[PDB]
Amino acid sequence: RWIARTFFDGPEKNYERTMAILQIEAEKAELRLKELEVRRLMRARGDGPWFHYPTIDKELIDHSPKAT
Amino acid sequence: AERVAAFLKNVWAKEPVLVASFAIAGLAVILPTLSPYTKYSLMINXXXXXXXXXXXXXXXXXXXXXXXXXXXXXXXXXXX
Predict the structure, then answer these.
(1) A-side interface with B, Cβ within 8 Å?
(2) Are B64 and B73 in contact (CB under 8 A)?
(3) Chain A CA closest to residue B52
(4) End-to-end CA gap in chain B
(5) How far is B70 from B72, CA to CA, in rounded Å?
(6) Cys-Cys with B1: which of A2, A9, B5, B33 at CB 3.0–4.6 Å?
(7) Between chains, do B52 and A64 touch, taking CB under 8 Å as contact?
(8) Contact assessment for residue B54 and residue A64, using Cβ atoms and an 8 Å cutoff
(9) Chain CA centroid to CA A1, Å
């Protein structure tokens, strides 16, 4: 009982805790698997703003020339 | 003067062609900015049409008329 105080965390700790660490771990694992799933799609088809190659130009010239 | 009067007459005595290399080239840079005559040369340069003229379709527009002589458009008349 003396060893339980100021030397031990207790059974309440690491049961309420660790599950909190697992809750962050579950979020870290699912989003990393989602990142592997998103990059597998975004690289194959140019749909989103990920792995997009730069284009030539947006605007260059529109004025009237001396063309035929 | 310490070098204005001293290091000028020495340059005339020792290689005076070097005086011409700095003075004439110096006047080539300073004078174009000072003279109020460069504005006229830019006016005629833009006025000279190398390419064919283009007609714009007008729908309520000012400062534009027919191809005949009329008080419209730019048409530079700087010194005839």
Answers:
(1) 64-66
(2) yes
(3) A66
(4) 51
(5) 6
(6) B5
(7) no
(8) yes
(9) 46
**Which experimental technique did the depositors report for determining this structure?**
cryo-EM
Quick one: which of A62, A33, A39 has its CA closest to A51?
A39
Between CA A67 and CA B52 the distance in angstroms is 9
Does any CB of chain A come closer than 8 Å to the CB of residue B52? yes
Q: Which two tokens stand for residue A57?
A: 């130009």
- Tell me how far apart the alpha carbons of residues B74 and B47 are, in angstroms, rounded to a whole number: 9
**Reported structure resolution in angstroms:** 4.1
Q: Measure the CA–CA gap between B47 and B68, rounded to whole angstroms.
A: 18
Burial class (CB in 10 A: 0-12, 13-18, 19+), A38: middle
Tokens at A42, concatenated: 């975004």
Q: Is there a contact between B39 and B78 (Cβ–Cβ < 8 Å)?
A: no
Asked if the Cβ–Cβ distance from B51 to A66 is below 8 Å, we say: yes
Question: A57, A39, A56: which is closest to A48 by C-alpha?
Answer: A39
Find out whether B42 and B78 touch, Cβ atoms under 8 Å: no
What does the radius of gyration of chain B's CA atoms come to, in whole angstroms? 25
